[PDB]
Each structure stands twice: as structure tokens, then as C-alpha cells.
Design a protein around this ligand. Structure first.
Ligand SMILES: CC(C)C[C@H](NP(=O)(O)CNC(=O)OCc1ccccc1)C(=O)N[C@@H](CN)C(=O)O
Ligand SMILES: [Ca+2]
Ligand SMILES: [Ca+2]
Ligand SMILES: [Ca+2]
Ligand SMILES: [Ca+2]
Ligand SMILES: [Zn+2]
Length: 316
């Protein structure tokens, strides 16, 4: 909408106060004009029609329980935009500052979040498996990263290419979580998963097997559920990424860690310069080796560690 840029205040899903960029024109809208061609947050009103209505508020204060998922979707989309711009010199998901749109309060009891080809969508959860999913910064960044992937490598959402697609979203979700630097970890979705169980998460990158996901290519899932295991076999790549950054010895193979920043540079370059819609795990290894070679040189530690990490998870 046309209006003037304003700054509202509200509370997110976890009860924390934050400022949010809004737009005033009769109402205050969840429309942040400070980033690209805008970040826009919508109310889906417990229905499945999308996007719903652009979020309107009478007083620019967002402290109601119903407001909390909108506050976080809007704010964390801003953090994710900032990460891509400041760290990777990428302007929104398409590289040309496309408007970023999210809808909250999608459906009833909906235990998921997704990119639908055009926008982000967040359920409220059923209060048992999830609370409103925009409360997780890693979740928000996971979803926006699907849009980045779709505009760049275009990884098809099935089998190995789809597991890479998933891992890319977990990797950058985690790197955005570290960028914001509030309780960062290598776990996925811990802030909104299972409110009655402490200390768990939907996936672990540091130890995928903690939740039954494979941590070695020889343990990959080969069936048809979950688009050929895209959220399962992602553990193999997540583990490799974790090892590149943090190091470790895994199935007897030692990896010297090179840190998060270099992990992000290597995988961002792989995603945007080398991967294709049908890339498999072996081709991802080759893309990461080439990317590290471009950035750091063929004889570098960074290249050697990429090779070590993929060896550790059984990907040649
Ligand atoms: C980080 C997480 C809390 C949320 C994450 N959602 P996502 O990967 O973005 C789910 N996208 C999808 O299906 O795209 C495919 C698609 C959907 C709609 C239109 C086009 C394409 C996830 O890990 N979900 C699991 C939750 N057991 C799942 O969906 O199995
Ligand atoms: Ca209000
Ligand atoms: Ca965390
Ligand atoms: Ca996390
Ligand atoms: Ca939990
Ligand atoms: Zn995903």
C-alpha cells in the first residue's frame, strides 16, 4: 500500500518484545519499506486461501496473542533479508529485490510451514507438535531459502536433488540463526517444536541420527515417502556442512573445521554458480570443492576440509 514508513512495537511467539517496520495509511500495516521492494505480512485467518489480507492494525502496537505469529514472520523475514544482503550481496530471493510476502494463521492446527512458489506460509501448529512456526528464526530463514534455491539452482524437490534442497534450507536457516546470535545452535526448529518436551528439535545437523535421520550415505532412505526422503536424507548433507564448519571425526574420518562464515561462502557459491535442478550428492561434493577452490585456492585447508567432510559421510 502507499503510505508512510512507521515503526511499531510488539511481542513475538516466545513473548519477546521487538520493533517492526510498518506502513501507515489509515491503518498501520505489516509492510516494511526499508528492505528492497518491501516485506509484507498477511493474515490467512485460519483458512487456506492465500495470501489473505495484508495485516492491518489500528494503533501500531502488536501485543495481542493473535498478533504474535505475524510479528515474528515479519521481523525474521527482515533478518533473513539482511543476512543475504549483508553477507552474500544478494538482494531478496530473486537477486533483484522481489517483494517478500508471508501469511500467518494458515489453516487450523497446521504443523508446518512452506514456500508455495510465490510466498511463505506458516501454520499455528496444534500446540503439541508445534506452536506457531514463525517463532523460529531458523524456520523463517529455511522457508525463504527455498525461494532462493528455486530462483538459483532450481533443485527438483525429490530424491537426492530434493535432499540437497532441504539441506540448503537447513544450512542457511542455521547460518541466519547464528547471524542474529540469539541462542544459536545446529538444531532445526527447537524454538517452536514440542512445547511440552525440552531439549529436542525437529532435526539435528550436528547429529542427525538423534532423530533417526541418516548421517552417512550408506544409511540413505531409498523409498517413496516424503518425496523420496527429502527431509530424511538431508541429514547426510547437513552432517557434512556441520563437519566443514565445526570439524570432528565421524566414522573414523577426521575433518578440520573452517568455521561458519566459510561454510556459508562455499555453499552459497555452490548453490548459485554450480548446482543445477538435477544435481545429486556426488555433484554437490564437486560443486563445493570447486567453490572452495575459487574462493580459497586448490591447496587450501578449506578445499581439503570439504573433501574430508564428504568422505566422512560417504559421498564421493
Ligand atoms: C523447518 C520446518 C519447521 C518446516 C519445513 N517445511 P518445508 O520443508 O519448507 C515444506 N515444504 C514443502 O513441502 O515444499 C513443497 C511445496 C509445497 C507447496 C508448494 C510447492 C512446493 C519442514 O521440515 N517440514 C517437514 C515437517 N515434518 C515436512 O514438510 O515434512
Ligand atoms: Ca494493535
Ligand atoms: Ca536456537
Ligand atoms: Ca536452531
Ligand atoms: Ca520441544
Ligand atoms: Zn524445507
Amino acid at each position: 500500500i502507499t503510505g508512510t514508513s512507521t515503526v511499531g512495537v510488539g511481542r513475538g511467539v516466545l513473548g519477546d518484545q521487538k520493533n517492526i517496520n510498518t506502513t501507515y495509511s489509515t491503518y498501520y500495516y505489516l509492510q516494511d519499506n526499508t528492505r528492497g521492494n518491501g516485506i509484507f505480512t498477511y493474515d490467512a485467518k485460519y483458512r487456506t486461501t492465500l495470501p489473505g489480507s495484508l495485516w492491518a492494525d489500528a494503533d501500531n502496537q502488536f501485543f495481542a496473542s493473535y498478533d504474535a505469529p505475524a510479528v515474528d514472520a515479519h521481523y525474521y523475514a527482515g533478518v533473513t533479508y539482511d543476512y543475504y544482503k549483508n553477507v552474500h550481496n544478494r538482494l531478496s530471493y530473486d537477486g533483484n529485490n522481489a517483494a517478500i510476502r508471508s501469511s500467518v494463521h494458515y489453516s487450523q492446527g497446521y504443523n508446518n510451514a512452506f514456500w508455495n512458489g510465490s510466498q511463505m506460509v506458516y501454520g499455528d501448529g496444534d500446540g503439541q507438535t508445534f506452536i506457531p512456526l514463525s517463532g523460529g528464526i531458523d524456520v523463517v530463514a529455511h522457508e525463504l531459502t527455498h525461494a532462493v534455491t528455486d530462483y538459483t539452482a532450481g533443485l527438483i524437490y525429490q530424491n537426492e536433488s530434493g535432499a540437497i534442497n532441504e539441506a540448503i534450507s537447513d544450512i542457511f536457516g542455521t547460518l541466519v540463526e547464528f547471524y542474529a546470535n540469539k541462542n544459536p545452535d545446529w538444531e532445526i526448529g527447537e524454538d517452536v517444536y514440542t512445547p511440552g518436551i525440552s531439549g529436542d528439535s525437529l532435526r539435528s545437523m550436528s547429529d542427525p541420527a538423534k532423530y533417526g535421520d541418516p548421517d552417512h550415505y550408506s544409511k540413505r532412505y531409498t523409498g517413496t515417502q516424503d518425496n523420496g526422503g527429502v527431509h530424511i536424507n538431508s541429514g547426510i548433507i547437513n552432517k557434512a556442512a556441520y563437519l566443514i564448519s565445526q570439524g570432528g571425526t565421524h566414522y573414523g574420518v577426521s575433518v578440520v573445521g573452517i568455521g561458519r562464515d566459510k561454510l556459508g561462502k562455499i555453499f552459497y557459491r555452490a548453490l548459485t554458480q554450480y548446482l543445477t535442478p538435477t544435481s545429486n550428492f556426488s555433484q554437490l561434493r564437486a560443486a563445493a570443492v570447486q567453490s572452495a577452490t575459487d574462493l580459497y585456492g586448490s591447496t587450501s585447508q578449506e578445499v581439503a576440509s570439504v573433501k574430508q567432510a564428504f568422505d566422512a559421510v560417504g559421498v564421493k
